Design an enzyme around this catalytic site. Structure first.
Site, PDB file in Angstrom:
ATOM      1  N   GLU A  21      21.714 -17.599  31.174  1.00 16.86           N
ATOM      2  CA  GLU A  21      21.221 -16.578  32.244  1.00 16.86           C
ATOM      3  C   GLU A  21      22.757 -16.416  33.022  1.00 16.86           C
ATOM      4  OE1 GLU A  21      19.111 -14.740  33.054  1.00 16.86           O
ATOM      5  OE2 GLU A  21      17.510 -15.469  31.844  1.00 16.86           O
ATOM      6  N   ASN A  34      20.639  -4.732  39.750  1.00 17.48           N
ATOM      7  CA  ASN A  34      19.901  -3.910  38.684  1.00 17.48           C
ATOM      8  C   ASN A  34      20.003  -2.648  39.245  1.00 17.48           C
ATOM      9  OD1 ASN A  34      19.586  -6.291  36.976  1.00 17.48           O
ATOM     10  ND2 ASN A  34      17.996  -6.798  38.330  1.00 17.48           N
ATOM     11  N   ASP A  80      17.361  -0.883  39.179  1.00 12.44           N
ATOM     12  CA  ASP A  80      15.777  -0.755  39.769  1.00 12.44           C
ATOM     13  C   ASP A  80      15.753  -1.350  41.022  1.00 12.44           C
ATOM     14  OD1 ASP A  80      15.757  -3.665  39.857  1.00 12.44           O
ATOM     15  OD2 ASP A  80      13.645  -3.658  38.505  1.00 12.44           O
ATOM     16  N   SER A  86      16.350  -4.290  42.346  1.00 14.39           N
ATOM     17  CA  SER A  86      16.117  -5.689  42.686  1.00 14.39           C
ATOM     18  C   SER A  86      17.580  -6.469  42.108  1.00 14.39           C
ATOM     19  CB  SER A  86      15.131  -6.383  41.721  1.00 14.39           C
ATOM     20  OG  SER A  86      15.479  -6.251  40.212  1.00 14.39           O
ATOM     21  N   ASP A 100      19.236 -10.297  40.872  1.00  9.07           N
ATOM     22  CA  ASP A 100      19.070 -11.801  40.016  1.00  9.07           C
ATOM     23  C   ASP A 100      20.165 -12.395  40.678  1.00  9.07           C
ATOM     24  OD1 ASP A 100      16.941 -10.763  38.535  1.00  9.07           O
ATOM     25  OD2 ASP A 100      18.664 -10.100  36.935  1.00  9.07           O
ATOM     26  N   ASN A 154      14.850 -13.369  40.663  1.00  6.24           N
ATOM     27  CA  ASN A 154      14.805 -12.044  40.599  1.00  6.24           C
ATOM     28  C   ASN A 154      14.143 -11.676  42.327  1.00  6.24           C
ATOM     29  OD1 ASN A 154      13.100  -9.199  40.407  1.00  6.24           O
ATOM     30  ND2 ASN A 154      14.998  -8.976  39.726  1.00  6.24           N
TER      31      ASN A 154
END
EC number: 3.2.1.17
Length: 129
Positions: free
Chosen positions: A35, A46, A48, A50, A52, A59
């Site tokens: 990760e 991201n 979208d 959001s 991480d 998230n």
């Protein structure tokens, strides 16, 4: 901070992740490797909306609050910035919740694609825990 494999294994053991909910310690170290490359400061923003955050790429839509994400649930009840610390405690505490709230480690796409079904014990081989 960028952890070493055994450094991280030991830290996660001290924080209770070995065999947590049936997932052996190897799984967690493997997940962290793919990760974030063991980097506590890893951030992935991201398209979208959001983001991480941190060593386990948690998230901001469901788990932490960054104030910029639509539909935020903040189920770990923490600011996402707490996940960027060199001290892994907040990330582990939140990870425990994630696996708990009925997902298993499938919440981590890197775990599902790179760790699942592999010999994860290799990730802690040679390590003093």
């Amino acid at each position: 901070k960028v952890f070493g494999r055994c450094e991280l294994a030991a830290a996660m053991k001290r924080h209770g992740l070995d065999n947590y909910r049936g997932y052996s310690l190897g799984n967690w170290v493997c997940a962290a490797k793919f990760e974030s490359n063991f980097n506590t400061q890893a951030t992935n923003r991201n398209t979208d909306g959001s983001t991480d955050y941190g060593i386990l790429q948690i998230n901001s839509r469901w788990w932490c609050n960054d104030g910029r994400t639509p539909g935020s649930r903040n189920l770990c009840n923490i600011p996402c910035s707490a996940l960027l610390s060199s001290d892994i405690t907040a990330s582990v505490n939140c990870a425990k919740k994630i696996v708990s709230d009925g997902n298993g480690m499938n919440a981590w796409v890197a775990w599902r694609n790179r760790c699942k079904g592999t010999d994860v014990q290799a990730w802690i081989r040679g390590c003093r825990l």
